[PDB]
Amino acid sequence: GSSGSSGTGEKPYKCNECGKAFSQTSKLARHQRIHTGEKPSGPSSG
Ligand SMILES: [Zn+2]
């Protein structure tokens, strides 16, 4: 019913690039890696 699981709390460590909310900082970074253009891109995603 609801788009994804997004409860309440503190998600200030969200990706300022795309806008993804993670549980912790370590998670955010591990993701921001896809923004540095280092990893091998695949499908079309903004
Ligand atoms: Zn991002």
From Swiss-Prot:
Highest taxon of the source? Eukaryota
What is this protein's name? Zinc finger protein 347
**Segments forming C2H2-type zinc fingers:** 13-35
Q: What is the lineage of its organism?
A: Eukaryota, Metazoa, Chordata, Craniata, Vertebrata
Q: Which gene encodes it?
A: ZNF347
Species this chain originates from: Homo sapiens
Q: Which family does it belong to?
A: Belongs to the krueppel C2H2-type zinc-finger protein family.
The protein's role, per its UniProt record: May be involved in transcriptional regulation.
Q: Where in the cell is it found?
A: Nucleus
